[PDB]
């Protein structure tokens, strides 16, 4: 009765994220930038609600990860005609998060109906968009719950 749950969340955020050691110290030649600050509300969720999390139903092992990826839009000609050299390039930069945390459980849910597949997955994941900010929006999301079905 310590069945495991798996939740993997991805985000998108165009601007650079900032290191938390770098708030009191940062070079004035870089101070006028933009950053996607406050990308850590995900971590904060498991400290405010630490008192509400029961012992039957408890999160643990929450971790983040960073990546970067460029998409290519193409080199577009800059003139109306007869200038092949004139090409201004265009591209797109992104930064993805990858949250991943487990929550244990004493329960194990039973299934007896199709509608139960909707009561537990489809209503929650569609209502998971709250876990979001303006710049930090989410592409995908995952939930894994062990279950029981009485086939035959």
């Amino acid at each position: 009765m310590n069945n495991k749950i798996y939740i993997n969340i991805k985000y998108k955020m165009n601007f650079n994220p900032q290191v938390i050691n770098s708030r009191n110290i940062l070079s004035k030649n870089k101070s006028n930038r933009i950053y996607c600050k406050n990308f850590i509300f995900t971590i904060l969720f498991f400290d405010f609600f630490n008192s509400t999390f029961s012992k039957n139903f408890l999160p643990y092992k929450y971790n983040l990860h960073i990546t970067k990826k460029r998409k290519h839009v193409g080199s577009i000609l800059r003139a109306p005609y007869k200038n092949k050299i004139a090409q201004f390039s265009l591209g797109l930069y992104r930064y993805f998060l990858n949250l991943s945390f487990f929550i244990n459980s004493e329960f194990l849910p039973n299934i007896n109906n199709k509608f139960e597949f909707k009561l537990l997955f489809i209503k929650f994941l569609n209502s998971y968009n709250y876990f979001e900010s303006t710049l930090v929006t989410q592409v995908s999301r995952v939930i894994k719950i062990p279950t029981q079905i009485q086939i035959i």
């Binding site: 998409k71 839009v73 193409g74 577009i76 201004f88 390039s89 265009l90 591209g91 797109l92």
Partner: protein, 101 residues
């Protein structure tokens, strides 16, 4: 009558709607025609009907909604060449930046 853009957008529109609805028809006919295991006749009678249709709504070619110019298009944005040089001045394009590798 209509100016060139608002006309030509409709031509390239009606060509797709035809395809959208004769989709299932033209996928089954073409399925039989390439089914080598069948006799040749039924493979041909489908080829006979497959041509007995409006080809005019099949000669599709891309177009830009804004300029009316057809040859160069950015599929990532769905708009043209003469326009992106303009919007890039205004910065209207979202999340784009100049590649400095």
């Amino acid at each position: 009558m209509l100016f060139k853009r608002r006309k030509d957008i409709l031509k390239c529109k009606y060509k797709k709607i035809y395809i959208f609805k004769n989709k299932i028809k033209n996928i089954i006919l073409k399925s039989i025609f390439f089914n080598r295991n069948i006799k040749n006749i039924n493979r041909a009678y489908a080829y006979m009907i497959l041509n007995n249709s409006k080809i005019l709504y099949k000669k599709y070619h891309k177009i830009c909604k804004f300029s009316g110019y057809r040859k160069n298009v950015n599929k990532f944005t769905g708009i043209g060449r003469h326009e992106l040089n303009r919007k890039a001045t205004l910065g209207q394009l979202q999340n784009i930046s100049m590649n400095s590798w």
